[PDB]
Amino acid sequence: SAVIKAGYCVKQGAVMKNWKRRYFQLDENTIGYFKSELEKEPLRVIPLKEVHKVQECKQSDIMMRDNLFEIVTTSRTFYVQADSPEEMHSWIKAVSGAIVAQR
């Protein structure tokens, strides 16, 4: 249950749809995010079993955000901007591989 991937990404907030830098952490069962790398408790945990898709966001142009992927769950789609194209692909590949490993 160790960490597979961790790092900062900038995600869209629900209250007013602003974008905020948060620390993301993926392990074999969950992806969660934290206020920063120092925090002990996450702001939200998303069980990978509840992830229907993880993919490049096709609305990246309209949302005016480069390097944007999304995590689709029934109740909410999360919009997550990586720091580079390379990190966007790294995050998508890591989350998708962890979901595969759950099969």
UniProtKB/Swiss-Prot annotation:
What range(s) does the PH domain occupy?
A: 2-100
Coiled-coil stretches noted in the UniProt entry, renumbered to this chain = none
- Name the GO cellular-component terms: cytoplasm; cytosol; extracellular exosome; nucleoplasm; plasma membrane; ruffle membrane
Can you say where in the cell this protein is located? Cytoplasm; Cell membrane; Nucleus
Work out whether the entry's keyword set contains Plastid.
no
Q: What molecular function terms (GO) are annotated for this protein? A: PDZ domain binding; phosphatidylinositol-3,4-bisphosphate binding; phospholipid binding
Q: Which UniProt keywords apply?
A: Cell membrane, Cytoplasm, Lipid-binding, Membrane, Nucleus, Phosphoprotein, Repeat
Q: Where is the signal peptide?
A: none
Q: Which GO terms describe its biological process?
A: androgen metabolic process; B cell receptor signaling pathway; cellular response to hydrogen peroxide; establishment of protein localization; estrogen metabolic process; face morphogenesis; Leydig cell differentiation; luteinization
In terms of one coarse class, where is the protein primarily found?
Answer: cytoplasm
The tissues in which it is expressed are:
Highly expressed in skeletal muscle, thymus, pancreas, placenta and lung. Detected at low levels in brain, heart, peripheral blood leukocytes, testis, ovary, spinal cord, thyroid, kidney, liver, small intestine and colon.
Supply the domain comment: Binds to membranes enriched in PtdIns3,4P2 via the C-terminal PH domain.
What's the subunit arrangement here? Interacts with MPDZ and PTPN13.
Name the job this protein performs.
Binds specifically to phosphatidylinositol 3,4-diphosphate (PtdIns3,4P2), but not to other phosphoinositides. May recruit other proteins to the plasma membrane.
Task: Please identify the protein, giving its name as recorded.
Answer: Pleckstrin homology domain-containing family A member 1
What gene name is given for the protein in this entry?
PLEKHA1
